[PDB]
């Protein structure tokens, strides 16, 4: 499977955009968390379908599949947000009809901070002028890197090979290709951090009874489906 075929395969595997409506009235702490939890719940279902389409993912053991998804789900959702928000400075496009300003993040105690990380990281990707094909490879790398064990490493290199292939097709000097590759990957740490903060925040909202946490969403939150 050549890099281009890998990229083309990820392009097709892209999940359809989840259609969720913005609440009629201005957000309240509760209605904002309601919207975010429902969105995540719907997106998690498509994420699993998406994952099963990444070349070689299903060939891993069910246990590795489960652990990769439990570990990276929020990171993946967030990478999608950043990409969707890239051509919209100041805004976070959680979904086609769920566009939030950083301000609205005030009705929810402790979320403004998270919205800040997300907007900041989005700005860097925008500044780097992230491309669609690069994005596809990166999102997949996030899933495969939240580490059969030997087959996982090969799958990760394959997608990395693909990312390298995409950057080279940009035509910049070889030295600048290495530099862009480094700049893009250095941001994964930031996505991971925002994910950690986002999941910690979601758990607290659940404990404080600020919003109910769905079956799938809850399993992913606790992250010990295998026990």
């Amino acid at each position: 499977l050549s890099p281009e075929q890998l990229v083309l395969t990820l392009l097709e595997a892209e999940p359809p955009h989840v259609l969720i409506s913005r609440p009629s009235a201005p957000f309240t702490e509760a209605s904002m968390m309601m919207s975010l939890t429902k969105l995540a719940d719907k997106e998690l279902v498509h994420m699993i379908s998406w994952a099963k389409k990444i070349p070689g993912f299903v060939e891993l053991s069910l246990f590795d599949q489960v652990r990769l998804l439990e570990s990276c789900w929020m990171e993946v959702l967030m990478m999608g947000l950043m990409w969707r928000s890239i051509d919209h400075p100041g805004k976070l496009i959680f979904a086609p009809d769920l566009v939030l300003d950083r301000d609205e993040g005030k009705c929810v105690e402790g979320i403004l901070e998270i919205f800040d990380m997300l907007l900041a990281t989005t700005s860097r990707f925008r500044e780097l002028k992230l491309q669609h094909k690069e994005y596809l490879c990166v999102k997949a790398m996030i899933l495969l890197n939240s580490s059969s064990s030997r087959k996982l490493a090969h799958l990760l290199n394959a997608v990395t090979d693909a990312l390298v292939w995409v950057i080279a097709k940009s035509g910049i000097s070889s030295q600048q290709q290495s530099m862009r590759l480094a700049n893009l990957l250095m941001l994964l740490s930031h996505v991971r951090h925002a994910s950690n903060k986002g999941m910690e925040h979601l758990l607290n909202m659940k404990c404080k009874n600020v919003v109910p946490v769905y079956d799938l969403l809850l399993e992913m939150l606790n992250a010990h489906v295998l026990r």
Binding site: I48, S49, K52, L62, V66, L69, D215, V225
Partner: peptide
């Protein structure tokens, strides 16, 4: 169920 979606679908 994560496992279900993974294997049942």
């Amino acid at each position: 169920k994560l496992v279900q979606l993974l294997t049942t679908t």
